[PDB]
């Protein structure tokens, strides 16, 4: 028992934002 | 000793008076801190030494404009308490403004203005700044105007509202909280000075020469006026026109005190060196209907009264001079009844310039103050707006919910429909 | 003060909501692992409405998950951004609904909401002055739209003086997910009028459509559509969080954007958009951004919006912008095209500005639009549940937890009820 | 100069009065030797409460340990904490009952109550004032119930005076450790009615729940139950061996929370009971204290508290508050719901403010609750009772010892005497 | 020369005891170890080489929160003895106090009060701190005002008390003990005036901008309550108001005696550079029902007699500018009997800020203590609780187990009645 204290690439992102939200790097076209 | 309290109800009434104490606390000379390094005293209370409190109260009840000016650049010189916030916004309805949730915000309001009161010698007048628009300009402010007129009885009150524009407006129940508010306002307000929008838009395009205008721009010269139409308890000067003398000579009837406004010296810097700045250029520009802070045209309507202050130095003829060149002029029409109609006001401190404003300084100003028939007009098309879109009983279910009923609508229609009628009898030739 | 109760029910709303807190921490300035580092101060000082102050600088937002099955549950707190979330508020059966309302609604719903009303109405209690019920689900699955509606339905007379967001995905009309959702959908909506303030109608072929031809992304995957999303519901409040020159709350866009109680169906865009091949290319000005607001590619909606006529609108600006700017394109485009508005309301389209911008954005806005277009989507579940409830297919599963086809014919009745009142209004 | 006299009986008594003595020790900061170690000096102030000086600044507890089996000694010695009681009060024996009510009272008892009360007499005079004794014991059992009671009766005609606690552990409602218990249970109830001056229950299922679900620990153990029954039990004192702004003492504790001599037998509960993995994302202020304080979960006997009222409330909070959020969060909850609180007794809540809080936590709490829900907890042993006594069962063991069935009636109408009084006061 | 005996009694009294004398330890520049680092005369007596002993007992049946100040910071103030401690304690029990456990620490409590006596030349009068709802404040508080009389008739026994309030209390047994040892406190007590715990919680948190207050808050600013009201004494002023004064002035009647408080400037330090500090105004806030030390509204009922106690740079003539506009305010009641309902008291000395205090630095100060017809809703609404508990006969046993009889619960009960009853018909036009 510890009552007194705690003491304790599927996501796929693909977009970002510079000045205008847009693509990292992966691909378009 | 000269005294006036403003309160500042509603988005538009703090994001004035934002501006309006900017400019009362440049005028004495007072940092924004609140220590001056007697015409403070008509503005400041002096507290002690050294520290000064202004005599106002803001008060919204959405809880967010509030904390820009506890957290602003204000934020010592205001009292911490004199700052009024809410729990929540009346959302754009007069029903929540003045019935459910302004009742337990605005018994705050009233027992802070019986403290400011207390605390000054004489007070003079009443100045509200509010839009009849929105929820909580409009109903809190209707909601304190029932209050104040009760308890500090037959007190002149002023009262500077930002109506919905023709064109220009933001909100699509808009026209229902106007006409809702006006059934207050009337039997109320002694003289309410109106304002809009996109008119101070209007004047800061061509004469400010400034593209991109925003809420701070025409707030900035809003105060202007503000302390224009105030400059006669703060300094001296020939003619003193205080609050007591502008009701009294500008108002003909109970039911008939609407109000233009007018500043006609509303010069950029560079625009400044190149202008030859009379009191017969400044009268003329002031008349011009390009100027006025409301979009009615007065050649459509007739003047009715009118009031003008000076600033800066002004000798007292050639206002003279320039008053026999308007009364003169055949594109300006006066109503047969009235035969003198304008109010003399020469101050003599000119007017100050904000640090980063677009207003460079110049050294003479003057603001038309006129009661007209041609806010009829601009009462006609709001009501024109109201009447076609009640015929299919739109955005009720809003207002009947919180404490209004459904025939309110009414009375205020014919409210605003005897008023139409007033303004059309009243500039009829006998 | 106020603060903002999102729930989130269903396959679809879990996902959603990891991604809508991804980008709210991220713009508020707290890291993954839960201390705040936000540099502007103005950030700081409105935190409460979607995070909850905790020891040590902690923050954990005002949020539950809610799902029948803890494959959704597993995968929101596996990834990144996951781990600030409430572990009480991670509600979750055995069951499964698997498309089924009746599962959802009545049979295998009922003896898990009582634990999820339980840590709502903690949560609630805890916090001072209740905003909305803004909720995240499905229409067409069966996890969030029976299991949510329900919670919709139950959490209105527990506090019947809040406004309420529905962020509920529609079935797409070219394609589909689910064989037996018009079923489900029609049976959602008829539970939604009564009961919900106002809808934020979404789809997911507008996503991809919006991806592919405006972002220029030939492969998106549910990273880039629950992103734009995410921006959108961060944009929804913006007011809340920032000063602005003109704030608006969830009921200032509610009064300003329903004529009447039933007419409560908007349509919603996001308008900075700009692919990286033109990403040097395009001038961010207030015009801008208002030329593509009012476009019909860049809606999150099926319906075509020039097809129906706007009856009210909405505009949430973010950023530095002079008003004047704000308000002239906004009188511009009801001048311009008024065949495309309505003709018996006048100033129909209402504005907002928030003067803090998202992140990396220097200009963001978000419309919301009722309008007559949104019968075109109803319409299109409407025919669809009529051919398939003639003959009573699939509904051995749906009658066989109780509910009667009575109650379809009730659910019918509400949905022709829709598609009778727009209609009629366009005229 | 109030002192507490100790007394554990039995195979649960012995056992779980050590894990007592265990968080005592470590809060007082006394060693497994017997020296003191702690930080501040406000654990010196009050040590006479509980503990004994001696030669070379050693501190014994004023506990008697006694039990007929000798298997609890060979364990009690032997864990951890165990050597600092002196070995005189170490008195057993060497039959044993065997779960038997009637040979720990009158057969195997006989010969050795004698030598227990020359050892608590040895040391009650011993010190300067007596505050009373606390009893730890069973009542499933047979060795801490017949020979515990008959304690608890002899000490009450010698020291009529003082004041008792009987931490007695029922039988578990769901599930039942011994099958002699329902006898063994109702004979006990039967004297410690009109012998001890109050009476708090444990119960073990009670206990279960809350070691899992709420601290969230998949195999807690025997010794993580007993933290529990031993972290109540230290919160009951807290007051007494520490300053504090509101000082309850245990008298405090009797007459405050007791409004009828009969009705004394309490619900305990403690308060701040959060998780390992769910601690940092909790903000450990008082308003989270009071909402998991008036849990239905969070009390530790088999009652529910929405079934009945509470007569008369209780609070023992531990360390630095400000006790106006104390004050009316009690006033709330007195607000919130007044059909759950017993009406004609106004502001039924007490609250006492210790200003030291235990050791590693910063803010607890401590409810006494003498609830008319545990009338459920008499009804379900009382018609257990009735049924095995109306077919004589197991009854030839419990009379062959000198036992005869008018007690048997006796402590049935004792039993449901308490039932219908707690019921005649809820309405 | 003048001298109070202040006597503290139960645990609320060590608490207010400790900040009153963490009070008046500053006033008069009194370090914690006793040494000055004329006016201390009055409250601390000059012993040996400048050692300054205060004239208070600290007497309670719990040996903890006694033993607090024997291990604070004011170790070598008080004198060991004069603090008085029992075994054990009442617990809120008013049997145990009177009858069985405080009968044999009173012959102790006399025996320090009689050498106090002694050694004071001119005692003005005792003053009395307590709660009724503490075993001791009730049961001991009561047997000692009950010899002091007897030992020292018609000297002045200025009593203030703190009463349950309506909405919050920590005891179900506070409204036992609350009109039980009132019965002691109409007979005995000549001037008992009310404190009220969940008032003080409005104050803070309204004035002060306190959100999260505790009781080292409240006790604060009710000792600067009482060293307001004592300061006439130890500072000279305009016009001197003595303990004797205050008797004669705001006593109508033997039985009508129980009157409230109120202070007035209460600003914290960045609120005290915005507001004007002017006696027009801080006399208004004085009658406000913010400013009301005990929970009820002062407008329900009538002001009866009122006394104005005035510290710091305030001139005499604006405070009966003050006066003048407050008589005429209406929604402030007076009684049309007593038309001259105001006492006018000023003191020279500005109040002494403590270190860590809530309240700010402030040149000017009032304090209203004044008798009032609407205290009588403070005992109507104890009352009123005192029928639902009694009624079911809950709590006796112990009551009647100690010594003590019933039967004067029904003696108790009538006392109490006759109170209320005379609070009604004296009101009354
Ligand atoms: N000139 C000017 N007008 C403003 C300003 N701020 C708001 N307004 C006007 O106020 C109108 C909205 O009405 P308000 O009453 O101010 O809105 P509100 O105070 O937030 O009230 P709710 O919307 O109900 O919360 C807008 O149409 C603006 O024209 C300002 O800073 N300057
Ligand atoms: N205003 C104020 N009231 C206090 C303070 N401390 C305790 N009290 C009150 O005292 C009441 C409790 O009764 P006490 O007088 O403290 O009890 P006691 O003096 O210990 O007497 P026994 O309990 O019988 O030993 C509580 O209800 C509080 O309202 C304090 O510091 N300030
Ligand atoms: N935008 C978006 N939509 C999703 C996501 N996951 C599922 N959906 C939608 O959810 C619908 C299917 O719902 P379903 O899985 O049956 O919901 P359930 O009831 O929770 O099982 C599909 O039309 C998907 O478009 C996601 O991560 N993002
Ligand atoms: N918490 C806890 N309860 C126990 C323990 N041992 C026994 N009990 C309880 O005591 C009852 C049985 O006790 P028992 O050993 O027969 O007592 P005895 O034989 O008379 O000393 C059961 O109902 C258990 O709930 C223990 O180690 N911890
Ligand atoms: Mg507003
Ligand atoms: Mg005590």
Not at chain 2, 199 to 214: G, K, M, N
Not at chain 2, 265 to 275: G, L, Q, T
Not at chain 2, 390 to 412: P, T
Not at chain 3, 37 to 58: C, K, M
């Amino acid at each position: 028992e510890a009552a007194a204290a705690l003491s304790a690439d599927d996501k796929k992102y693909a977009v970002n934002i510079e000045a205008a939200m847009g693509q990292m790097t992966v691909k378009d076209g | 000793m000269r005294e006036v309290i403003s309160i500042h109800i509603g988005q538009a009434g703090i994001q004035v008076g934002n501006a309006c104490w900017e400019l009362y606390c440049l005028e004495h000379g007072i940092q924004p801190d609140g220590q001056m390094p007697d015409a403070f005293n008509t503005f400041f209370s002096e507290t002690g030494a050294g520290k000064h409190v202004p005599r106002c109260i803001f008060l919204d009840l959405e809880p967010t404009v509030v904390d820009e000016v506890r957290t602003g650049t204000y934020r010592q010189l205001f009292h911490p308490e004199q700052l009024i916030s809410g729990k929540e916004d009346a959302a754009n309805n007069f029903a929540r403004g003045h019935y459910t949730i302004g009742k337990e915000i605005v018994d705050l309001a009233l027992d802070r203005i019986r403290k400011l009161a207390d605390n000054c010698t004489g007070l003079q007048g009443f100045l509200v700044f509010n839009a009849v628009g929105g929820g909580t300009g409009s109903g809190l402010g209707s909601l304190l105007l029932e209050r104040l007129s009760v308890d500090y009885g037959k007190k002149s009150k002023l009262g500077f509202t930002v109506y919905p524009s023709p064109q220009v407006s933001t909100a699509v129940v808009e026209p229902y909280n106007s006409v809702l508010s006006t059934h207050s306002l009337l039997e109320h307000t002694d003289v309410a000075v109106m304002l809009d929008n996109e008119a101070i838009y209007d004047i800061c395009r061509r004469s400010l020469d400034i593209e991109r205008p925003t809420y701070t721009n025409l707030n900035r010269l809003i105060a202007q006026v503000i302390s224009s139409l105030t400059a006669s308890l703060r300094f001296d000067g020939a003619l003193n026109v205080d609050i007591t003398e502008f009701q009294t000579n500008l108002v003909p009837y109970p039911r008939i005190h609407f109000m233009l406004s007018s500043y006609a010296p509303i010069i950029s810097a560079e625009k400044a060196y190149h202008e030859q700045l009379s009191v017969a250029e400044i009268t003329n520009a002031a008349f011009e209907p390009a100027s006025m802070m409301v979009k009615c045209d007065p050649r459509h309507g007739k003047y009715m009264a009118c009031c003008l202050m000076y600033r800066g130095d002004v000798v007292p003829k050639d206002v003279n001079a320039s008053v026999a060149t308007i009364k003169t002029k055949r594109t300006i029409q006066f109503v047969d009844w009235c035969p003198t109609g304008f109010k003399c006001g020469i101050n003599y401190q000119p007017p100050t310039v904000v640090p980063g404003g677009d207003l460079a300084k110049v050294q003479r100003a003057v603001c038309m103050i006129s009661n007209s028939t041609a806010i009829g007009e601009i009462f006609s098309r709001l009501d024109h707006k109201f009447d076609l879109m009640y015929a299919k009983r739109a955005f009720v279910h809003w207002y009947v919910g919180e404490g209004m009923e459904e025939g309110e609508f009414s009375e205020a229609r014919e409210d605003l429909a005897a008023l139409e009628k007033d303004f059309e009898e009243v500039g009829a030739e006998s | 003060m106020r603060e903002i109760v999102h729930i989130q029910g269903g396959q679809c709303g879990n996902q959603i909501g990891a991604k809508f807190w991804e980008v709210v921490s991220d713009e508020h300035g707290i890291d993954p692992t839960g201390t705040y580092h936000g540099d502007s101060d103005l950030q700081l000082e409105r935190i409460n409405v979607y995070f909850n102050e905790a020891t040590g600088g902690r923050y954990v937002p005002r949020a539950i998950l809610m799902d029948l099955e803890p494959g959704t549950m597993d995968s929101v707190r596996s990834g990144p951004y996951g781990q600030i979330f409430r572990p009480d508020n991670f509600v979750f059966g055995q069951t499964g609904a698997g498309n089924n309302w009746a599962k959802g609604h009545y049979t295998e719903g009922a003896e898990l909401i009582d634990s999820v009303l339980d840590v709502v109405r903690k949560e609630a209690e805890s916090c001072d002055c209740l905003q909305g019920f803004q909720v995240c689900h499905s229409l067409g699955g069966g996890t969030g739209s029976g299991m949510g509606t329900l919670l919709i339905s139950k959490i209105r007379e527990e506090y019947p003086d809040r406004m309420m967001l529905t962020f509920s995905v529609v079935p797409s009309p070219k394609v589909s997910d689910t064989v037996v959702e018009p079923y489900n959908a029609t049976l959602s909506v008829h539970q939604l009028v009564e009961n919900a303030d106002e809808c934020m109608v979404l789809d997911n072929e507008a996503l991809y459509d919006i991806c592919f031809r405006t972002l220029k992304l030939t492969t998106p995957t549910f990273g880039d559509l629950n992103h734009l999303i995410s921006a959108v519901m961060s944009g929804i409040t913006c007011c809340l969080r920032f000063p602005g020159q003109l704030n608006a709350d969830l009921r200032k866009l509610a009064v300003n954007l329903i004529p009447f109680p039933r007419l409560h169906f908007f349509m919603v865009g996001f308008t900075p958009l700009t692919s990286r091949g033109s990403q040097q290319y395009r001038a961010l000005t207030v015009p801008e951004l208002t030329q593509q607001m009012w476009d019909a590619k860049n809606m999150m909606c099926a319906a075509d919006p020039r097809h129906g006529r706007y009856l009210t609108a909405s505009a949430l600006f973010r950023g530095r912008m002079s008003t004047k700017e704000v308000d002239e394109q906004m009188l511009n485009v009801q001048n311009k095209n008024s065949s495309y508005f309505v003709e018996w309301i006048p100033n129909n389209v209402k504005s907002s500005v928030c003067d803090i911008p998202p992140k990396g954005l220097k200009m963001s806005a978000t419309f919301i639009g009722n309008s007559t277009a949104i019968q075109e989507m109803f319409k299109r579940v409407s025919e669809q549940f009529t051919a398939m409830f003639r003959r009573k297919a699939f509904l051995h599963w749906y009658t066989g937890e109780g509910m009667d086809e009575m109650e379809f014919t009730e659910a019918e009745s509400n949905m022709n009820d829709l598609v009778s009142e727009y209609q009629q209004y366009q005229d």
